[PDB]
């Protein structure tokens, strides 16, 4: 990467996986600085999307290694490194404006 890859984008999160769960879970894999869940602009419901910022690139990479395609609360997580929420924002747009749901967004 051309800059430090410290941030992970999650998609297809079960709607019970909110900020406290995310932080507790991701602390197993690296030191977590911040967690954020994205909500629908109108309903304020969970889009299955989240941002988790780590202190080190090692924490972001370990998180991706261990959680991508892992089932958490009965849904298979998508987890990838993301710069400036490029992919995360596309997924937001596809679910909110497009025809997709949180569990069917194409990644």
UniProtKB/Swiss-Prot annotation:
Subcellular location(s) of the protein: Nucleus speckle; Chromosome; Cytoplasm
Superkingdom of source: Eukaryota
Domain (RRM) ranges: 1-84
Function per UniProt: Histone methyltransferase that catalyzes methyl group transfer from S-adenosyl-L-methionine to the epsilon-amino group of 'Lys-4' of histone H3 (H3K4) via a non-processive mechanism. Part of chromatin remodeling machinery, forms H3K4me1, H3K4me2 and H3K4me3 methylation marks at active chromatin sites where transcription and DNA repair take place. Responsible for H3K4me3 enriched promoters and transcriptional programming of inner mass stem cells and neuron progenitors during embryogenesis. Required for H3K4me1 mark at stalled replication forks.
Quaternary structure note: Component of the SET1A/COMPASS complex composed of the catalytic subunit SETD1A, WDR5, WDR82, RBBP5, ASH2L/ASH2, CXXC1/CFP1, HCFC1 and DPY30 homotrimer. Forms a core complex with the evolutionary conserved subcomplex WRAD composed of WDR5, RBBP5, ASH2L/ASH2 and DPY30 subunits; WRAD differentially stimulates the methyltransferase activity. Interacts with BOD1L1 (via COMPASS-Shg1 domain) at replication forks. Interacts with HCFC1. Interacts with ASH2/ASH2L. Interacts with CXXC1/CFP1. Interacts with RBBP5. Interacts (via N-terminal region) with WDR82; the interaction is direct.
Related illness: Epilepsy, early-onset, 2, with or without developmental delay: An autosomal dominant neurologic disorder characterized by early onset of generalized tonic-clonic seizures associated with sharp wave and sharp slow wave discharges on EEG. Some EPEO2 patients have normal psychomotor development and normal brain imaging, whereas others may show developmental delay associated with abnormalities on brain imaging. Neurodevelopmental disorder with speech impairment and dysmorphic facies: An autosomal dominant disorder characterized by global developmental delay, intellectual disability, speech delay, subtle facial dysmorphism, and behavioral and psychiatric problems.
Domain-related comment: The RRM domain confers RNA binding activity.
UniProt family annotation: Belongs to the class V-like SAM-binding methyltransferase superfamily.
Protein name: Histone-lysine N-methyltransferase SETD1A
Organism per entry: Homo sapiens (Human)
Whole-protein residues included: 89 to 195 of 1707
